[PDB]
Amino acid sequence: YQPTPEDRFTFGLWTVGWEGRDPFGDATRRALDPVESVRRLAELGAHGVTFHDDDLIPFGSSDSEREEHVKRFRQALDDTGMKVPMATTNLFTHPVFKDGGFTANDRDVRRYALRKTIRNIDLAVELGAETYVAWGGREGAESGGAKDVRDALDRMKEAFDLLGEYVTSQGYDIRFAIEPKPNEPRGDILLPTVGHALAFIERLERPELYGVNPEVGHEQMAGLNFPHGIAQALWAGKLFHIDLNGQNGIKYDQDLRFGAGDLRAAFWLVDLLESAGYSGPRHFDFKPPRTEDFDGVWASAAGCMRNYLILKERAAAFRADPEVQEALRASRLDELARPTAADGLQALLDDRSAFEEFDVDAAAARGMAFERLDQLAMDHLLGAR
Ligand SMILES: [Zn+2]
Ligand SMILES: [Zn+2]
Ligand SMILES: [Zn+2]
Numbered sequence: 001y002q003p004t005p006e007d008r009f010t011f012g013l014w015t016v017g018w019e020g021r022d023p024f025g026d027a028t029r030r031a032l033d034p035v036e037s038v039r040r041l042a043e044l045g046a047h048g049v050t051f052h053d054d055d056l057i058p059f060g061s062s063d064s065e066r067e068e069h070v071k072r073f074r075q076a077l078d079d080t081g082m083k084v085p086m087a088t089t090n091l092f093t094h095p096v097f098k099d100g101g102f103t104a105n106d107r108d109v110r111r112y113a114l115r116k117t118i119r120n121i122d123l124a125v126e127l128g129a130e131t132y133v134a135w136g137g138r139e140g141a142e143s144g145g146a147k148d149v150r151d152a153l154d155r156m157k158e159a160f161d162l163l164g165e166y167v168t169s170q171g172y173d174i175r176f177a178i179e180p181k182p183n184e185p186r187g188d189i190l191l192p193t194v195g196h197a198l199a200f201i202e203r204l205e206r207p208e209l210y211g212v213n214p215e216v217g218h219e220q221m222a223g224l225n226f227p228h229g230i231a232q233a234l235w236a237g238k239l240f241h242i243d244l245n246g247q248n249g250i251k252y253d254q255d256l257r258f259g260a261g262d263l264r265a266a267f268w269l270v271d272l273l274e275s276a277g278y279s280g281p282r283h284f285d286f287k288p289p290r291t292e293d294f295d296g297v298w299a300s301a302a303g304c305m306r307n308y309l310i311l312k313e314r315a316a317a318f319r320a321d322p323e324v325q326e327a328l329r330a331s332r333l334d335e336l337a338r339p340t341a342a343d344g345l346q347a348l349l350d351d352r353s354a355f356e357e358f359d360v361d362a363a364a365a366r367g368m369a370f371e372r373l374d375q376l377a378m379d380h381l382l383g384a385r
């Protein structure tokens with residue numbers, strides 16, 4: 001279960017670089033130089049890194065300082081063979097974004113948010129990023145009167161449309177991916193789930209330029225089934241990027257290493273990504289717990305990748321098992337994949353076997369055999385066949 005760059009594993013600079021500051025606690029680790037993170041991640045078998053503008057260049061840097069930071073980062077990438085497949089903008093840390101970036105009530109803040117984003121899109125393209133993520137963590141409200149949501153969605157659409165106009169005007173191939181989250185740090189965050197983001201994207205002027213970057217923990221913070229959400233995103237052709245970590249149910253965003261939290265959901269996620277042939281980065285957005293020192297940080301990062309590879313093996317074994325294939329037929333998964341009425345509406349209406357002569361009792365009596373199928377899945381996950 002040793003990862004290599006061919007496995008496409010990526011990490012945010014802000015993940016392994018998390019200093020351990022939480023709402024009730026000060027930092028437990030010193031800041032990392034992005035250069036050292038690139039080196040350490042490469043040694044572990046990572047394929048690349050991702051960044052917020054403010055992770056790579058200290059906020060407020062001069063053009064000269066900016067150039068020097070990028071120069072050192074570029075050298076680390078060249079020294080290691082590491083890539084930068086995705087970037088994003090920090091529109092949440094600075095107090096100016098306390099009511100949002102793109103949907104701040106203050107118009108001047110919204111304009112600044114767009115300019116800050118655009119500047120980093122240029123840099124992202126320069127560093128080779130194919131995906132530009134937006135997490136609207138400050139977009140929302142703690143109280144009902146503070147945010148007219150229809151107005152806010154108008155502003156959100158305007159922002160994304162402008163960003164699409166910009167990339168098109170520069171001939172960039174980069175695409176956007178919205179990363180949903182239901183709450184935290186706002187009481188309620190706009191576009192709170194994969195569903196809400198997907199629906200919003202359909203109203204953008206150039207919908208083809210936008211997808212989702214769903215995070216395991218975030219959908220789980222709404223008690224939702226992450227594999228189900230990913231399936232809907234795939235069904236819509238919008239899984240542009242994936243965001244991997246762990247979470248124990250409905251509480252604050254834990255960002256545990258991937259495999260931690262809901263282990264069986266991680267199994268079914270890997271099963272789906274591999275079955276669907278998802279070809280993008282396998283990106284980790286996780287926090288090594290603040291209990292850890294730097295050795296613990298790298299152990300937690302290594303664990304992300306190891307757990308993906310273990311689950312990939314077990315899912316593949318599950319699907320390849322002739323006994324499982326038989327169980328899938330017993331549970332009529334084959335029938336699920338067949339059209340309900342390829343014969344058409346009129347034929348359906350005229351088909352007495354569909355209603356007038358349908359034996360509902362005989363159909364009802366047929367067990368689905370899902371428990372046997374699921375215990376085969378459990379046995380495969382646990383290596384207990
Ligand atoms: Zn690649
Ligand atoms: Zn500096
Ligand atoms: Zn998270």
Ligand SMILES: [Zn+2]
Nearest residue numbers: 179215243285
């Ligand atoms: Zn994330």
